[PDB]
């Protein structure tokens, strides 16, 4: 076969970043579909080919393992697939029709990468151990591989919500309520709560609106990132506020305020669910010590970064913990974060 | 002379770290005198030593300066002046009396370090640029520098207040109330911004005592330290919220929280001083960035970390700024964090 002819060569070319500006005229219309597709024909195959040299230079006692193997295997068969839409005229509406179909199974052929890559970690905890310098390696490869999968997921999703045949621009909303998202996160979250727990804290949701105060805050951003970091940041907060007030009868709410400035939207979510020590905090967000015989919170951070964001934790032992959710404000400056290869 | 053989001799130790249990011993009495003067006598030309070889190994430009020659001329001088008390027997009281006055001296012929060390970095600046490659190297030589400064003064104060011929020791208090210190600084930044502004926020100070509630929050600490800390952020978080209702008449309290859990002890500092974008924080923190044609946070940040705590800073662009002092609770835990070498 072909695939590592086909790896060092798209490998050579660097990922190309995109904007939310870009994202938005590349689904301003239908007629852009000719556009999208010879542009992802090229970006996909590079964007798959980096990551799956990166994956070839691990050690040998990573690479040779079954969900290496498993994984690398989706990504040579996914490569291959966009391979045969190089020479395919753009001008032939089969051409894109089947274009977008082979999107979609590859989205799929990939849906079960993130348990299939816990299983990897678990496996080398047993095998080799879970010391320090593997921690950094395991965090460096993941946090970068995971954040290759979730840009190429985003172009796959914005061609083939659009180009199926609007205020919504694929899966992109450029005026999404924050407080709308972080209402929908904390009601799924309560949901769950109260059916394990038979008990769930309150909401309370603040604006600040710097520039014009009491007008609603509004953004150009992907909700269904929101909603995931939102989610796994709520139900955090309501295990810990919950299973902290065990012995007693008042159960604290949930505080979150969304600040909006000249160049960040920040949003803080608050709890009093007992806190965590400064020692155990860097522990949540890796891969090795959430594995054991999940990944919430390192991907949720990945969804932050994407665009150029962060997500931060700062507890207090004894009382509380505040996690803040910083993303950029303008469209300008929301530009996909790739891994720099 | 014997200068590069001392600091070549002395620099092939390790500096012990010491644990508050050990100062509180060293400090006990005055029998210890003996003692301290037989540890220090080695322990001090270790730690000078180690910290002279680093700067021996800065490059060529910044060694040949007038700062970083005259911060060397002292720390030679500072280490030959203990090299004569390696002979004396310490059972003559005179050798005693002897030492503690050679280290006031070595104290304040080192008191304006900090002042010279920020004349070399604006001197950086305008000769070299100010790149992020310099701003790294800066700051790595500048925190273990200004941390080894922190831990040789320690000791020496440690000596020279308690052998002078009892409640705290030395400058350690056993029964810190960390609420008293927060209002001590509190105050002293008030009386500053009442004379520059005509205005000052007012202060609300809540204690969590979780393992014991209602009690008052004491611990083993250095006051001097911990007001330092709090002193520098309180003046920041007056200046924002002064200056950023300048146009309003309604001036928002600074707010601070005192958290005891098992471990540590957490003072969360929050104004709503109008924020600072993310991509601003880590400036904040920088010598090079924050020197201009001063150094209290990335300091303060130094004392924290001297005993194995930590200061963070998380803003909200719009609305204000958290500061959390992260301290060990325990005094088994607050042990000596000195560079590593
Ligand atoms: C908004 C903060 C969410 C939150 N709260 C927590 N409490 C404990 C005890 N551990 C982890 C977490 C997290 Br993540
Ligand atoms: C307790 C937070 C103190 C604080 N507040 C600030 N506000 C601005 C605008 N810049 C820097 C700071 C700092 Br440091
Ligand atoms: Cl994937
Ligand atoms: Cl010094």
Known sequence: GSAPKYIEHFSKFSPSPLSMKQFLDFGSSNACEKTSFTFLRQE??????????????????????????????????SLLDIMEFLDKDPEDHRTLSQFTDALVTIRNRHNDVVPTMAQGVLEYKDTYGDDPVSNQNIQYFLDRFYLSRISIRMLINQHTLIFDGPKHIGSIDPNCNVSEVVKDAYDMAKLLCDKYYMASPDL?????????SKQPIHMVYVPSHLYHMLFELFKNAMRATVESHESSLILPPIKVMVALGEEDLSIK???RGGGVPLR???????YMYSTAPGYGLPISRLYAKYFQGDLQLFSMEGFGTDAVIYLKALSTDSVERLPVY
Chains 1, 2 share one sequence.
């Open 280 to 286: 155990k905090i860097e522990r949540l967000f890796s």
């Open 44 to 77: 996909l195959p590079v964007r798959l080919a980096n990551i799956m040299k990166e994956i070839n230079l691990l050690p040998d006692r990573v690479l040779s393992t079954p969900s290496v193997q498993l994984v690398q295997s989706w990504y040579v068969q």
């Open 204 to 212: 309370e949701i603040q604006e600040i609106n710097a520039a014009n």
């Open 269 to 271: 979510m608050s709890d």
